[PDB]
Amino acid sequence: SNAKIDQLSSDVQTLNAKVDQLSNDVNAARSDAQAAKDDAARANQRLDNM
Amino acid sequence: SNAKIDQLSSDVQTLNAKVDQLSNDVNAARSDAQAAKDDAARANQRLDNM
Amino acid sequence: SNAKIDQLSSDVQTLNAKVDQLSNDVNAARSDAQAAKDDAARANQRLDNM
Incomplete structure (x- = not known):
């Protein structure tokens, strides 16, 4: 035993x-995923202002 | 023991x-990463249509 | 025991x-998160060139 x-x-x-x-x-x-999410949100917001 | x-x-x-x-x-x-991937794909598709 | x-x-x-x-x-x-990060970076770079 x-x-x-x-x-x-x-x-x-x-x-x-x-x-x-x-x-x-x-x-x-x-951390990586959250950073990607925020960057993708930024891209899409910049697209909205166009 | x-x-x-x-x-x-x-x-x-x-x-x-x-x-x-x-x-x-x-x-x-x-889940976060998949959501970021889809949002980044959306951004890039909106860019293609421009 | x-x-x-x-x-x-x-x-x-x-x-x-x-x-x-x-x-x-x-x-x-x-892997997913890194791929999303790179795609979001691409979107934002394409936006910079506009």
Whole structure:
């Protein structure tokens, strides 16, 4: 039962690293998408004034 | 070995909460990006008709 | 203590599947957002030349 638990300890450690980095990726994708949304809104507003 | 397992139980519980909320963040980033893509496509189509 | 550990094994397995698929979702949201950003930049550049 000792090895079983340390295989879990490792798995959880690996998952933790994967979830932390995915959080950074999600934050970045969120920021990118919001910036694209605002730029597309600007383009369309400039088009309305024409 | 009892404490080792309850440290794992906790870790897994925490990770679960982190992955659920990241799923909501990913869904939101996906939706945002698709909306930006469509708005940018609209801008460029309006430009083509000019 | 045997059942406790196999409940964990399962939980970790499930989480793994959730994190892998979220990685695919994040990669997709990242790509989508970058594409929207570039299209919005194109729209705004075409507007500048007008």
